[PDB]
Ligand binder design. Structure first.
Ligand SMILES: CCCCCCCCCCCCCCCCCC(=O)OC[C@H](CO[C@@H]1O[C@H](CO[C@H]2O[C@H](CO)[C@H](O)[C@H](O)[C@H]2O)[C@H](O)[C@H](O)[C@H]1O)OC(=O)CCCCCCCCCCCCCCCCC
Ligand SMILES: CCCCCCCCCCCCCCCCCC(=O)OC[C@H](CO[C@@H]1O[C@H](CO[C@H]2O[C@H](CO)[C@H](O)[C@H](O)[C@H]2O)[C@H](O)[C@H](O)[C@H]1O)OC(=O)CCCCCCCCCCCCCCCCC
Ligand SMILES: CCCCCCCCCCCCCCCCCC(=O)OC[C@H](CO[C@@H]1O[C@H](CO[C@H]2O[C@H](CO)[C@H](O)[C@H](O)[C@H]2O)[C@H](O)[C@H](O)[C@H]1O)OC(=O)CCCCCCCCCCCCCCCCC
Ligand code: CLA
Ligand code: CLA
Ligand code: CLA
Ligand SMILES: CCCCCCCCCCCCCCCCCC(=O)OC[C@H](CO[C@@H]1O[C@H](CO)[C@H](O)[C@H](O)[C@H]1O)OC(=O)CCCCCCCCCCCCCCCCC
Ligand SMILES: CC1=C(/C=C/C(C)=C/C=C/C(C)=C/C=C/C=C(C)/C=C/C=C(C)/C=C/C2=C(C)CCCC2(C)C)C(C)(C)CCC1
Ligand SMILES: CC1=C(/C=C/C(C)=C/C=C/C(C)=C/C=C/C=C(C)/C=C/C=C(C)/C=C/C2=C(C)CCCC2(C)C)C(C)(C)CCC1
Ligand SMILES: CC1=C(/C=C/C(C)=C/C=C/C(C)=C/C=C/C=C(C)/C=C/C=C(C)/C=C/C2=C(C)CCCC2(C)C)C(C)(C)CCC1
Ligand SMILES: CC1=C(/C=C/C(C)=C/C=C/C(C)=C/C=C/C=C(C)/C=C/C=C(C)/C=C/C2=C(C)CCCC2(C)C)C(C)(C)CCC1
Ligand code: OEX
Ligand SMILES: [Cl-]
Ligand SMILES: [Fe+2]
Lengths: 336, 35, 448, 35, 37, 61, 33, 56, 346
């Protein structure tokens, strides 16, 4: 028509008729995730071993170097680099990039930029369909959690080596070293997040049971119960008064939601608020505000010290403090 | 009823948050005070 | 007050009832502006009341006094304290003045006219009136531009501020020559934020910190007049949402980013947050360890250059990946540090071997021995060691309170951004209430 | 490596400018709502 | 510490920081007084 | 002039505790502002009186 | 038991009492809150 | 000088540019995307008006 | 029924038991209510007054200075190791105040908790049959029972004592968790790796379905408080399953299309997770743990250049075992020179 080249282009990005919606976050999400995906696969398979700690003992992380799926990892950037922006072109040779912890910092910068914008297009499509916009808020609870383990925690420590590796056994070392230095289990933000998922799983097992247990009889018994629902129907597929009536007898009548719109808000609000504190937990633990510490706290008269369980957890932490980075510490404090 | 409910919960809710402050006060003094 | 059946807003989303009520809303901000000043006065007098002026200021759990002390009130050379009467005045000044804001917050919220539109025409505003918003914007740019000049005038005429880079321990200095070069000032903004560059935390002298405020003082007065005499252009009409909640969420996107910067500046910058007052930084306390434990070999006489470590790297001094003479161990990650107790020990090629073995002042080790002990890593009940440290001392740095609080405060405002900027975009379109159930769009689209 | 650094700057500032000049192009009227 | 003409008022000033927390608690008291209309 | 100041400053807290309590009661009563209009002006000005009175003799102490 | 710790807690009773006292005096006398 | 490299990580050069071809790359790509947007502004509505946004 | 049989005393008792009331008693209430009440009441008694100084050798009560985090009803000592510690039995012999001192108040809570959990699951059966529903709420609660029975009962009945059970306290769990990392390497058991995916996967379905419903609602009121617009007896649904399908179909790629299958999928993901983690604890009760990979312990034995994070984890498990087991297992009477425990340097 009389439309420009640009208007032809903007009526394609914001077109909802596409199989996967792009939108304007997706024009910079899609080339960042396909960057970060395609480099994650290669370094998980063919990365040469990385000096993680700067002491020139390279750690293996590739499947081609005698690892399996569980011990495979993408090894973090070396301790000598620290927080210096280390792209591919600052290295002289390409193998100097790989040995120093190259593809960790390439992935994380494209990953975190990708998931900030995957949250963006969850808003953007919801504006293109007339939906209410707050699904993008609920995706910020993992985005707050993933920003902390990759970016907010290496800032407070000063190096990308202390961030979390991209591996299954790589994660498990990061959980151990963290609690040895910061005692995460004795921090009320990790206590909220633990209740965020034990409550979150309970509120899914309980809600999903009662909707299944109040289904209306529409099929036979040889046919599955999922055939009673036909897609896009108007009438309700389960009795709601019967499930409040059941759950009202179960504990007491005031302990239930009869308003199903107030119910589904509670299912959204409980884990999302819970993950927000355990995302802010290690965000504050990144700036060295560890947790509780009740060592040598219960004492009697005559100046003696009684053990508690907190002194037992001390012995676990003290056994891991003196073992992580085994050839690094030249000095009797772990300030770094 | 006789007494309004709103100053029932205020008096009880003050004496509950007044009660919690003792247990924080008792955390730095007395037993378990680490001294 | 009001009710739910006339506005459709419950008791908990109740402050949203006074969107279209101009006058009540004015009392709502004034009353809240009282509480900020009231917290400023009360917490200042509280911290003066528990202040021992012979111990260091950062040891006693203090955050508002080093803000006043950075300006140079009652302080002398090396970070000492002369008199604590000016710290008493500002706590008194804010606390009395909060009641003046307190009366205006009570008055307009109760008895003053709830819509000041047709009675007071200069103050009345409709949220779609774009010329009126750019006025109310442009007035406050002056009030926030003039406030930048007060720091400039106090650093150039009224005694000056605490310059921690002065020779022989920092003290109060009148900054006579502010660096106002635009290439020098705007070099910080378009600098990368990664290590060694440090976007705006790496401003290292007092010559620039007040040097920059001459720009932002001038621009916010030049920009404030610009928005008074102009309306937004038709591309800005094609770009923004022009409601009441939309103006809020624009702000919440801004001060979410403000929190993350003050989160980082109080953790890294020992120039605007001097280490004599706020305590040492994390990178400063770690580099203080290897320096003081290099004095602890000079008393024994072993060669710090030839001290090879267990991995063959150098126990005390090693080489940077850009080729500079730095410290060694696990503190190699902090080699980007600069500090006034250590910068008189560096030459061209980093720190000099011949200078470190001979040219150590006695006060430099004395300051670098407090900074080994008072490292900022602590606990939550204020124990103050590593997590494997028993209940002995009672210290955790104000840098660790400011970086943790202003991260979380500056985080939820970004969640505050994504709430309101979605809702204001939805409610301007029409479907904030839900799907229509009669003419809805998804039933009018093609499949897949 | 300079040949690679001049290529990333062409790539990034292409997609960054599709972003900035994309939201300016009357995105708040690209909605299914009616008035 | 406080000045010496002001030192008998140290017990009052150790309450003053907690006051703004009591304003958000007042707003729930007032909404219970109107019984959440 | 210490005890002159301390009696004047105990007097301030008694007036402020009146003005913290009574002044919202004056506003939120029906027609309470048209009745006690000059009454509050006495209590407000006496607050403004004492704050300079306490403020001036700090130079003498 | 100090004279300082006591008068501090006397000071806290008066302020906490002053909160709902504004609510009580308008729930009885005026009725406009 | 075993190897040749950038030597540009701790330098603080503005926008990371060190060769002036990068500034023309930063600016020339920007002006081209602006030029296509400015031409195609004819289709995006003409809000030369008193108040014509997505108001409420 | 339908032949006029007479009424017996048992029939008369049933009507009182299955009478509607503010709290439902039923027949299962005779098993539930006196067994559940003594469990938590026996927990609050033990955490408050009852020591642990004779069993483990460490204080555990509020009457000793332990706070809410560090108070625990502790397990018995490893002397008994499998006795039920009856208050009349030979380890106690009637004396109550010496019965608590041997840690026997642990077994009072664990055993009265088990018959509580049987009774509470029976509670969900007879309420469902009264209201004539389907039993799927009862079937989901078996997965908390399988976690309880395996961890607190099958695991000490396979190990050497009730000593190695978890103690009913907050920080006492925190060593039991840290027991399983060093001594078992429990993070590499795939039965726990399928437990995590059940927990974190069900937390994700609680957050999406609660937000997809809440953002695809139908405009039925006019106040913006959208909770007001729900008459719960209405025949139509409250949100748009068509729109919610097309959102995640273009955001994510595949989405639900079946409201019956969806809530059943929210049933299946947490239940399979715990049931696939109750199997892993059974292997730990026999110490059939997935501690090692053979082909990497060999390669790290002959070469001091090869390592992974796996070999870095085996050293950290040695740091938990060789350090805390001096105080954790006091019945083993073992002492350590400070040279026999592994360290790094400085
Ligand atoms: C009900 C729900 C159920 C129960 C839930 C429990 C949580 C309820 C809310 C918790 C608040 C409790 C307040 C009283 C306990 C307390 O804290 O009391 C402690 C203190 C005062 O107690 C004193 O606390 C001191 C703290 O040390 C301080 O002083 C030391 C030197 O003495 C050092 O200088 C050190 O640096 C400095 O921290 C010492 O430990 C004293 O021994 C001790 O007596 O009260 C205070 O501070 C009060 C805190 C005021 C400031 C709060 C905001 C701070 C924001 C910064 C952190 C960001 C958010 C957290 C991120 C993680
Ligand atoms: C463009 C891409 C931006 C990406 C942000 C990366 C930030 C990482 C970082 O290195 O940040 C650190 C920088 C400061 O940089 C530091 O700057 C320092 C400057 O100090 C030097 O100079 C100082 C001058 O006083 C001192 O003297 C000091 O001792 C001396 O060493 C050093 O150079 C350090 O090496 C250098 O790392 O802070 C800042 O840039 C503050 C601005 C960015 C804050 C970001 C915080 C994380 C937020 C993530 C989003 C939150 C979650 C949202 C999800 C929902
Ligand atoms: C080390 C250093 C590295 C440096 C790197 C460089 C970084 C540069 C950062 C710049 C960041 C700015 C980004 C925001 C720009 C916003 C532009 C805008 O909102 O723009 C909105 C406005 C809209 O303008 C209006 O557009 C209107 C369009 O009308 C048309 O459309 C109307 C309806 O749409 C009617 O139909 C009407 O009939 C029809 O004519 C009219 O033309 C008006 O007269 C006109 O005022 O545009 C304008 O004013 C734009 C005014 C400013 C333009 C700036 C251009 C700068 C170019 C620099 C040199 C580049 C060289 C390029 C070479 C290319 C080849 C190699
Ligand atoms: C600091 C926070 C703040 C502020 C300034 C306001 C302010 C306001 N709110 Mg909001 N509100 C808040 C928090 C806040 N609110 C919170 C946290 C909630 C959730 C509980 C609400 C929920 C809410 C609802 C549901 C409603 C309001 C309404 C109002 C307005 C009128 C209230 C009224 O009629 O007074 C009458 C109240 C009283 C007479 C009680 C006494 C109040 C006095 C002022 C306290 C005095 C304090 C202090 C001691 C005075 C010192 C003296 C001074 C002179 C020195 C007012 C502008 C109403 C509205 O929509 O207005 C149109 C309304 O319906 N608010
Ligand atoms: C915080 C205060 C504030 C606020 C809220 C606003 C808000 C607004 N301004 Mg105002 N303005 C302000 C301060 C403020 N301004 C100041 C201080 C100045 C003086 C410089 C101006 C000058 C100004 C002009 C001249 C115009 C506005 C316009 C606008 C409107 C649209 C802005 C826009 O599209 O941004 C979106 C942001 C962008 C499109 C990109 C901006 C990024 C800039 C260019 C920063 C890059 C600078 C960089 C660091 C320098 C590189 C140096 C290097 C070469 C070494 C909006 C209502 C416009 C308007 O509507 O007219 C009334 C308009 O024409 N403002
Ligand atoms: C119905 C609820 C219920 C259930 C299931 C249990 C179950 C249990 N309790 Mg708890 N208890 C209950 C109620 C219950 N109790 C109440 C109400 C009290 C308060 C008084 C207690 C107080 C209590 C204490 C203080 C203790 C227990 C203990 C026990 C355990 C030992 C069981 C045992 O030896 O009984 C054996 C008896 C039976 C199983 C009854 C069987 C019926 C017989 C076979 C009928 C034949 C009778 C016939 C006349 C006998 C003739 C003998 C003749 C030759 C002389 C077991 C887990 C002990 C424990 O926890 O272990 C550490 C313990 O110390 N309970
Ligand atoms: C949540 C908010 C958290 C805080 C946000 C605010 C702080 C973060 C931003 C810091 C300042 C960034 C300004 C420019 C800095 C800079 O140019 O560094 C330039 C940096 C690094 O540039 C490097 O500089 C080094 C030192 O000279 C070396 O020379 C390297 O070769 C060079 O690459 O480039 C980047 O980090 C990538 C920029 C791409 C940004 C993509 C996002 C765009 C999204 C859409 C935006 C719409 C508007
Ligand atoms: C609207 C409203 C609201 C709010 C309100 C407010 C917020 C208010 C504020 C107010 C304020 C904000 C006030 C303030 C006040 C203050 C004052 C009143 C002060 C005083 C002071 C003094 C008295 C001092 C004294 C002294 C001195 C002189 C010095 C030292 C010593 C002493 C301390 C003694 C609410 C929420 C409720 C809701 C409803 C309505
Ligand atoms: C004082 C100081 C200083 C200085 C400072 C300064 C000078 C600053 C400035 C600053 C500035 C000057 C800034 C700016 C910024 C900007 C921005 C931040 C922008 C933003 C943008 C936006 C936000 C946009 C958006 C959009 C898009 C994207 C598209 C469409 C739509 C819209 C439009 C919305 C110094 C450093 C020297 C020193 C220190 C201190
Ligand atoms: C400056 C000053 C002053 C003033 C002060 C003030 C201004 C105060 C205020 C105060 C206040 C104003 C307070 C308030 C209070 C209140 C409260 C403390 C309440 C509480 C409550 C509760 C805690 C509860 C709640 C609840 C309810 C009721 C319902 C819902 C649920 C619950 C239960 C949560 C004076 C003059 C004295 C003098 C000195 C200085
Ligand atoms: C062993 C025994 C037994 C039993 C006994 C019992 C059963 C008891 C019970 C007991 C009980 C039944 C107890 C209860 C308790 C409770 C408590 C002790 C509580 C506490 C709490 C607290 C401390 C807190 C509170 C709160 C909360 C919750 C939060 C917020 C705040 C408040 C404060 C409100 C029998 C006889 C079988 C045999 C003999 C011996
Ligand atoms: O990097 Mn991964 O973990 Ca933060 O502490 Mn020192 O450095 Mn290392 O050791 Mn401990
Ligand atoms: Cl080290
Ligand atoms: Fe549901």
């Amino acid at each position: 028509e009389n439309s420009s080249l640009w208007a032809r282009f903007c009526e394609w990005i914001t077109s909802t008729e596409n199989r996967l919606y792009i939108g304007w976050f997706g024009v910079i999400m899609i080339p960042c995730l396909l960057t970060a995906t395609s480099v994650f696969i290669i370094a998980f398979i063919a990365a040469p071993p990385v000096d993680i700690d700067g002491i020139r003992e390279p750690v293996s992380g590739s499947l081609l170097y005698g690892n399996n799926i569980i011990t495979g990892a993408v090894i973090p950037t070396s301790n000598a680099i620290g927080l210096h922006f280390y792209p591919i072109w600052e290295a002289a040779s390409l193998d100097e990039w790989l040995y120093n912890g190259g593809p960790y910092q390439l992935i994380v910068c494209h990953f975190l930029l990708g998931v900030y914008c995957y949250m963006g297009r969850e808003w953007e499509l919801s504006f293109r369909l007339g939906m209410r916009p707050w699904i993008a808020v609920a995706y910020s609870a993992p985005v707050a959690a993933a920003s902390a383990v990759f970016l907010v925690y290496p800032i407070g420590q000063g190096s990308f080596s202390d961030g979390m590796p991209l591996g299954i056994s790589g994660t498990f070392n990061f959980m151990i070293v963290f609690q040895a230095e910061h005692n995460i289990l004795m921090h009320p933000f990790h206590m909220l997040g633990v209740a965020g998922v034990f409550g979150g799983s309970l509120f899914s097992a309980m809600h999903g049971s009662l909707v299944t247990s109040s289904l209306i009889r529409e099929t036979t018994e040889n046919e599955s119960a999922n055939e009673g629902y036909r897609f896009g129907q108007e009438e309700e597929t389960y009795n709601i008064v019967a499930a409040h009536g059941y759950f009202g007898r179960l504990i007491f009548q005031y302990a239930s939601f009869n308003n199903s719109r107030s119910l589904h808000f509670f299912l959204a609000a409980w884990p999302v608020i819970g993950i927000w504190f355990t995302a802010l937990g290690l965000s504050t633990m990144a700036f060295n505000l560890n947790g509780f510490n009740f060592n040598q706290s219960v004492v009697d008269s005559q100046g003696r010290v009684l053990n508690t369980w907190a002194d037992i957890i001390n012995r676990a932490n003290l056994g891991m403090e003196v073992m992580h980075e085994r050839n690094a510490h030249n000095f009797p404090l772990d300030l770094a | 009823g006789r007494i309004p409910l709103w100053l029932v919960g205020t008096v009880v809710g003050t004496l509950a948050i007044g009660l919690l402050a003792v247990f924080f006060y008792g955390s730095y003094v007395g037993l378990g005070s680490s001294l | 007050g009001r009710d739910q059946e006339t506005t459709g807003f419950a008791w908990w989303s109740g402050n949203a009832r006074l969107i279209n009520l101009s006058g009540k809303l004015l009392g709502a901000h004034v009353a809240h502006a009282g509480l900020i000043v009231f917290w400023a006065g009360a917490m200042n007098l509280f911290e003066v009341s528990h202040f021992v002026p012979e111990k260091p200021m950062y040891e006693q759990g203090l955050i508002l006094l080093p803000h006043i002390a950075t300006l140079g009130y009652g302080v002398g050379p090396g970070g000492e304290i002369i008199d604590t009467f000016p710290y008493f005045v500002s706590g008194v000044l804010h606390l009395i003045s909060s009641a003046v804001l307190g009366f205006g917050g009570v008055y307009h919220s109760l008895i003053g006219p709830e819509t000041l539109e047709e009675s007071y025409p200069f103050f009345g505003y409709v949220w779609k009136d774009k010329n009126k918003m750019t006025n109310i914007l442009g007035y406050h740019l002056i009030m926030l531009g003039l406030g930048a000049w007060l720091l400039v005038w106090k650093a150039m005429y009224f005694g000056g501020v605490y310059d921690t880079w002065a020779p022989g321990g920092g003290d109060v200095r009148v900054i006579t020559n502010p660096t106002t070069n635009a290439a020098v000032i705007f070099g910080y903004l378009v600098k990368s934020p990664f290590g060694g560059d440090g976007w705006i935390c790496s401003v290292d002298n007092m010559e620039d910190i007040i040097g920059g405020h001459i720009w932002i003082g001038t621009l916010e007065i030049l920009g404030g007049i610009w928005h008074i005499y102009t309306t937004p252009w038709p591309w800005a009409r094609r770009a923004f949402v022009w409601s009441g909640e939309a103006y809020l969420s624009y702000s919440l996107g801004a001060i979410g980013v403000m929190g993350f910067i003050a989160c980082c500046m109080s953790w890294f910058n020992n120039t605007a947050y001097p280490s004599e007052f706020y305590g040492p930084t994390g990178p400063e306390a770690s580099q203080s360890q290897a320096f003081t434990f290099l004095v602890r070999d000079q008393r024994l006489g072993a060669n710090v250059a030839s001290a090879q470590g267990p991995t063959g790297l150098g126990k005390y001094l090693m080489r940077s990946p850009t080729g500079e003479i730095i410290f060694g161990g696990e503190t190699m990650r902090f080699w980007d540090f600069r500090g006034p107790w250590l910068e008189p020990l560096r030459g061209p090629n980093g720190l000099d071997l011949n200078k470190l073995k001979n040219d150590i002042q006695p006060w430099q080790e004395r300051r670098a021995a407090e900074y080994m002990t008072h490292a900022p890593l602590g606990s939550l009940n204020s124990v103050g060691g590593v997590a494997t440290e028993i209940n002995a001392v009672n210290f955790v740095s104000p840098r660790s309170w400011l970086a943790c609080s202003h991260f979380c405060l500056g985080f939820f405002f970004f969640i505050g951004h994504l709430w309101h900027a979605g809702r204001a975009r939805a409610a301007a379109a029409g479907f904030e209430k839900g799907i229509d159930r009669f003419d809805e769009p998804v039933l009018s689209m093609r499949p897949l | 490596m300079l040949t690679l650094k001049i290529f990333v700057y062409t790539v990034v500032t292409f997609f960054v400018c599709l972003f900035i000049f994309g939201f300016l192009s009357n995105d708040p009227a690209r909605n299914p709502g009616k008035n | 510490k406080l000045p010496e003409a002001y030192a008998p008022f140290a017990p009052i000033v150790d309450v003053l920081p907690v006051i703004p927390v009591f304003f958000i608690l007042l707003a729930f008291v007032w909404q219970a007084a109107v019984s959440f209309r | 002039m210490t005890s002159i100041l301390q009696v004047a400053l105990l007097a301030l807290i008694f007036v402020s505790f009146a003005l913290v309590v009574g002044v919202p009661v004056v506003f939120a009563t029906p027609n309470g502002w048209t009745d006690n209009k000059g009454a509050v002006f006495s209590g407000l000005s006496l607050w403004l009186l004492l704050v300079f009175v306490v403020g001036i003799l700090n130079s003498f102490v | 038991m100090n004279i300082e710790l006591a008068l501090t807690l006397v000071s806290l009773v008066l302020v906490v009492s002053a909160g709902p006292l504004v609510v009580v005096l308008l729930s009885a006398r005026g009725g406009n809150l | 000088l075993v190897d040749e490299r950038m030597n540009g990580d701790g330098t603080g050069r503005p926008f990371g540019v060190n060769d002036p071809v990068l500034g023309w790359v930063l600016l020339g790509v920007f002006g081209t995307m602006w030029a296509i947007w400015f031409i195609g502004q004819k289709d995006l509505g003409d809000f030369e008006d008193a108040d014509d946004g997505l108001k409420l | 029924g339908t032949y006029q049989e007479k009424r017996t005393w048992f029939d008369d008792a049933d009507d009182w038991l299955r009478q509607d009331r503010f709290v439902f008693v039923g027949w299962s209430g005779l098993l539930l209510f006196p067994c559940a009440y003594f469990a938590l009441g026996g927990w609050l008694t033990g955490t408050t007054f009852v020591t642990s100084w004779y069993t483990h050798g460490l204080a555990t009560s509020y009457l000793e200075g332990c706070n809410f985090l560090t108070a625990a009803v502790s397990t018995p000592a490893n002397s008994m190791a499998h006795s039920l510690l009856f208050v009349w039995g030979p380890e106690a012999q009637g004396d109550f105040t010496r019965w608590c001192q041997l840690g026997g108040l642990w077994a009072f809570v664990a055993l009265h908790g088990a018959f509580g959990l049987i009774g509470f699951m029976l509670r969900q059966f007879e309420i469902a049959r009264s209201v004539n529903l389907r039993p799927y709420n009862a079937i989901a609660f078996s997965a908390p029972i399988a976690v309880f029975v395996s961890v607190f009962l099958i695991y000490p009945l396979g190990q050497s004592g009730w000593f190695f059970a978890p103690s009913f306290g907050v920080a006492a769990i925190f060593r039991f968790i840290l027991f399983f990392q060093g001594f078992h390497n429990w993070t590499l058991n795939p039965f726990h790796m399928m437990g995590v995916a059940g927990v974190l996967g069900a937390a994700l379905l609680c957050a999406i379905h609660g937000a997809t419903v809440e953002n695809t609602l139908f405009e039925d009121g006019d106040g913006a408080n959208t909770f007001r617009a729900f008459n719960p007896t209405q025949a139509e649904e409250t949100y748009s399953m068509v729109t919610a399908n097309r959102f995640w179909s273009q955001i994510f790629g595949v989405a639900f299309s079946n409201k019956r299958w969806l809530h059943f999928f929210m049933l299946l993901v947490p239940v399979t997770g715990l049931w696939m983690s109750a199997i892993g604890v059974v292997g730990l009760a026999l110490n059939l743990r997935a501690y090692d990979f053979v082909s990497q312990e060999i390669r790290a034995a002959e070469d001091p250049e090869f390592e992974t994070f796996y070999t870095k984890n085996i050293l950290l498990n040695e740091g938990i075992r060789a350090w805390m087991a001096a105080q954790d297992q006091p019945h083993e009477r073992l002492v350590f020179p400070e040279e026999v425990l592994p360290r790094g340097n400085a």
